[PDB]
Amino acid sequence: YTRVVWCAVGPEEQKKCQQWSQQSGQNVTCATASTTDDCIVLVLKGEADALNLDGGYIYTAGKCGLVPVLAENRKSSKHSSLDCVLRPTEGYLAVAVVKKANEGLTWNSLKDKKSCHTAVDRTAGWNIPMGLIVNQTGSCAFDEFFSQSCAPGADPKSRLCALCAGDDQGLDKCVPNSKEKYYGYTGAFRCLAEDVGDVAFVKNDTVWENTNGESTADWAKNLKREDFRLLCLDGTRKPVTEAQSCHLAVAPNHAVVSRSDRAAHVEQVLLHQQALFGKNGKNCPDKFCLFKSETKNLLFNDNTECLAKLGGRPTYEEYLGTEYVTAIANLKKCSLEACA
Numbered sequence: 463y464t465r466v467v468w469c470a471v472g473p474e475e476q477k478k479c480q481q482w483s484q485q486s487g488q489n490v491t492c493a494t495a496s497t498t499d500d501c502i503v504l505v506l507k508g509e510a511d512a513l514n515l516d517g518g519y520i521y522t523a524g525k526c527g528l529v530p531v532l533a534e535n536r537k538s539s540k541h542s543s544l545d546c547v548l549r550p551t552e553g554y555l556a557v558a559v560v561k562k563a564n565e566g567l568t569w570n571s572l573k574d575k576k577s578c579h580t581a582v583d584r585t586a587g588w589n590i591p592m593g594l595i596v597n598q599t600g601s602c603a604f605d606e607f608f609s610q611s612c613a614p615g616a617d618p619k620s621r622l623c624a625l626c627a628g629d630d631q632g633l634d635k636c637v638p639n640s641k642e643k644y645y646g647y648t649g650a651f652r653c654l655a656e657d658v659g660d661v662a663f664v665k666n667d668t669v670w671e672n673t674n675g676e677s678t679a680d681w682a683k684n685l686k687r688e689d690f691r692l693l694c695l696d697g698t699r700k701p702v703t704e705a706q707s708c709h710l711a712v713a714p715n716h717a718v719v720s721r722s723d724r725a726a727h728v729e730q731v732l733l734h735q736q737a738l739f740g741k742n743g744k745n746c747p748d749k750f751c752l753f754k755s756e757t758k759n760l761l762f763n764d765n766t767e768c769l770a771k772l773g774g775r776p777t778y779e780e781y782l783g784t785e786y787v788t789a790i791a792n793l794k795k796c797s798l799e800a801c802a
């Protein structure tokens with residue numbers, strides 16, 4: 463009745479979802495799929511209600527008829543006086559990151575280097591950087607630009623998956639879910655941190671959250687911001703503090719999507735759920751916190767302050783915006799569920 467089946471992608475999200483289900487008196491239950499695309503299908507069938515998505519998947523879901531419901535909102539230095547749930551979303555910065563020690567590596571000498579992507583089809587890890595590379599290159603052969611990569615979601619046998627490591631046992635190599643060691647923002651950044659790749663396509667927040675003691679993980683423990691450099695499009699290299707002037711693009715925030723006939727219901731349930739387990743929530747941190755998962759960004763990014771209303775009741779094209787939407791169309795002409 464006032465119920466939403468959340469779609470978890472992978473066993474680790476399934477685990478976090480089950481805790482949330484317990485804690486919500488089952489006002490929220492869970493469905494699990496191996497990929498984000500399969501989750502989108504369960505929602506289309508009506509077997510799951512919603513899940514939080516990167517802009518790149520919002521475009522996929524968007525063509526299949528799903529709509530953005532609420533968006534992730536993180537800390538701000540403006541729009542401070544108004545509440546988080548009513549505050550407009552600012553978007554994040556897609557950046558290219560390298561080690562300072564890898565001197566002379568610039569945006570112009572990326573050909574034949576090793577890359578770390580969050581996953582195929584994602585905004586900062588794939589659509590933006592590959593879109594730029596296909597445009598600058600006049601060729602749709604992005605499968606040959608980098609010598610080796612870890613781009614979760616690609617053909618496990620291709621060079622685009624050579625750098626991926628799989629799980630603690632070597633299985634699930636290159637799967638586009640957290641079982642794959644170098645998946646998502648954290649994984650792609652770990653891929654560069656462990657010097658597996660030369661460059662990581664992540665967002666600007668990732669660098670800051672996994673350096674200078676912010677993360678207590680074993681591989682991030684000793685990482686220092688000064689040991690990293692951002693690659694700008696003009697050919698320069700800048701400190702990570704200069705992201706506002708050295709990013710590849712500003713990306714629309716990840717957002718919760720659902721089938722439109724369920725949008726209203728999913729919205730109400732979620733606003734109540736964050737009042738309980740949110741940042742200033744009734745039951746967080748003592749019983750449960752929806753937006754924490756020890757740096758793993760399970761279900762939601764860990765730096766989320768709240769899920770905000772959209773208002774202007776935007777379709778997915780308006781949400782993603784005309785600039786971003788045309789970018790994806792361009793890149794995809796290089797190659798239901800395939801919905802339009």
Ligand SMILES: *[C@@H]1O[C@H](CO)[C@@H](O[C@@H]2O[C@H](CO)[C@@H](O[C@@H]3O[C@H](CO)[C@@H](O)[C@H](O)[C@@H]3O)[C@H](O)[C@H]2NC(C)=O)[C@H](O)[C@H]1NC(C)=O
Binds near residue numbers: 593
């Ligand atoms: C890769 O190159 C393509 C082709 O140039 C880029 O797409 C182009 O993007 C611009 C800006 O988004 C579009 O211009 C816009 O045109 C509309 C009217 O058509 C106008 O109202 C806007 O003010 C703006 O001038 C252009 O239409 C679009 N071209 C195509 C064929 O889609 C694309 O953005 C590049 N990809 C990346 C990631 O940079």
Ligand SMILES: *[C@@H]1O[C@H](CO)[C@@H](O[C@@H]2O[C@H](CO)[C@@H](O[C@@H]3O[C@H](CO)[C@@H](O)[C@H](O)[C@@H]3O)[C@H](O)[C@H]2NC(C)=O)[C@H](O)[C@H]1NC(C)=O
Binds near residue numbers: 555670671
């Ligand atoms: C690049 O991404 C990082 C990570 O999100 C951004 O740095 C963060 O900046 C915010 C403010 O914009 C800081 O939030 C504030 O922290 C202070 C405590 O130091 C507190 O007064 C506020 O209540 C709020 O929590 C945040 O601390 C900081 N993150 C870290 C770990 O330094 C940065 O703004 C992004 N830059 C670009 C170009 O987007």
Ligand SMILES: NC[C@@H](O[C@H]1O[C@H](CO[C@H]2O[C@@H](CO)[C@H](O)[C@@H](O)[C@@H]2O)[C@@H](O)[C@H](O)[C@@H]1O)c1ccccc1
Binds near residue numbers: 783
């Ligand atoms: N508020 C987001 C808007 O969506 C459209 O806006 C982004 C740009 O977002 C700006 O947001 C403000 C705060 O709202 C920040 O201060 C700026 O730094 C950001 O650039 C567009 O690029 C994109 O087209 C997007 O669709 C929105 C308004 C109302 C309802 C839903 C979304």
Ligand SMILES: *[C@@H]1O[C@H](CO)[C@@H](O)[C@H](O)[C@H]1NC(C)=O
Binds near residue numbers: 485486487489734738
């Ligand atoms: C379950 O949903 C009902 C209906 O809104 C609400 O009153 C109750 O607080 C919810 N229980 C929990 C623990 O979320």
Ligand SMILES: [Fe+3]
Binds near residue numbers: 516584587713
């Ligand atoms: Fe993203």
Ligand SMILES: [Zn+2]
Binds near residue numbers: 709711
């Ligand atoms: Zn810009």
Ligand SMILES: [Zn+2]
Binds near residue numbers: 775
């Ligand atoms: Zn509209």
